UniProtKB/Swiss-Prot annotation:
Phenotype upon changing residue 98 to E: In mut1.27; shifts fluorescence lifetime from 3.03 to 2.85 ns
Mutagenesis / variant outcome for changing residue 171 to A: In mut2.1; shifts fluorescence lifetime from 3.03 to 2.50 ns
Biological process (GO), any one: generation of precursor metabolites and energy
Effect of residue 162 to V: In P9; increases fluorescence at 475 nm excitation. In R10-3; matures to the red-emitting state with excitation and emission maxima at 555 and 585 nm, respectively
Biological source species: Aequorea victoria
Primary role: Energy-transfer acceptor. Its role is to transduce the blue chemiluminescence of the protein aequorin into green fluorescent light by energy transfer. Fluoresces in vivo upon receiving energy from the Ca(2+)-activated photoprotein aequorin.
The keyword Lipoprotein belongs to this UniProt entry's keyword annotation: no
Protein name in UniProt: Green fluorescent protein
Keyword annotations of the record: Chromophore, Luminescence, Photoprotein
Effect on the protein of changing residue 188 to A: In mut1.5; shifts fluorescence lifetime from 3.03 to 2.72 ns
Effect of residue 44 to L: In mut3.3; shifts fluorescence lifetime from 3.03 to 1.88 ns. In R10-3; matures to the red-emitting state with excitation and emission maxima at 555 and 585 nm, respectively
Known tissue expression: Photocytes.
């Protein structure tokens, strides 16, 4: 089983290559994950200087295999079941009254490490909008990700809303559409409809000079 790969604390690498309205940028990430408790601790740095979008808009894109699926839930954990060969995760993210991100990622084991490698393409963003104008608060709300099986593609799909607090007290909505398909040929667990309940807290490393994000995350799956 893939779930045996997540019994302990697992190191994580994240590589992101991005392009939003022509602005190219890159983000690397490292940390570890404890699927037994649904916990992540990561640190992301922009390796191309200043990040051209607010860090919270990249959270969802920047390892749902680390979600805590409880005992009575084990057969709905598609993410771990595709390991180690991993899975492709694709999303379209529509920022209400602004542009959109399109992301292709591969989440798989590369030797010792859970790696998430991402291509991100952004278009149609307003230059004085909430994203390219950096008008979004440096924090993150709680969300419920609705997960549905996609038997046709031997995987899962999901659709959910992410609320970004706007600096002046608004909400910037980012409607997510997602689908995941395994990389390997092995059999995979196809869930019933269920939720992923997420929490996220963002902080800074006082000793880090680059543009960066320290992220702690708690996710547990919940049924019916």
């Amino acid at each position: 089983k893939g779930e045996e790969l997540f019994t302990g604390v697992v190191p994580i690498l994240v590589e992101l290559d991005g392009d939003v309205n022509g602005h190219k940028f890159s983000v690397s990430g490292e940390g570890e994950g404890d699927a037994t408790y649904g916990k992540l601790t990561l640190k992301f740095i922009c390796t191309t200087g200043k990040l051209p979008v607010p860090w919270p808009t990249l959270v969802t894109t920047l390892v749902q295999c680390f979600s805590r699926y409880p005992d009575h839930m084990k057969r709905h954990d598609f993410f771990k079941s595709a390991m180690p060969e991993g899975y492709v995760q694709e999303r379209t993210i529509f920022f209400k009254d602004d542009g959109n991100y399109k992301t292709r990622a591969e989440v798989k084991f590369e030797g010792d490490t859970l790696v998430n490698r991402i291509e991100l393409k952004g278009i149609d963003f307003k230059e004085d909008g909430n994203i390219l104008g950096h008008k979004l608060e440096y924090n993150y709300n709680d969300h419920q990700v609705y997960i549905m099986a996609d038997k046709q593609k031997n995987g899962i799909k999901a659709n959910f809303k992410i609320r970004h607090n706007i600096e002046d007290g608004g909400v910037q909505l980012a409607d997510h559409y997602q689908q995941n398909t395994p990389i390997g040929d092995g059999p995979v667990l196809l869930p019933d409809n269920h939720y992923l309940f997420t929490e996220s807290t963002l902080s800074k490393d006082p000793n880090e000079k680059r543009d960066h994000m320290v992220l702690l995350e708690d996710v547990t799956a919940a049924g019916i």
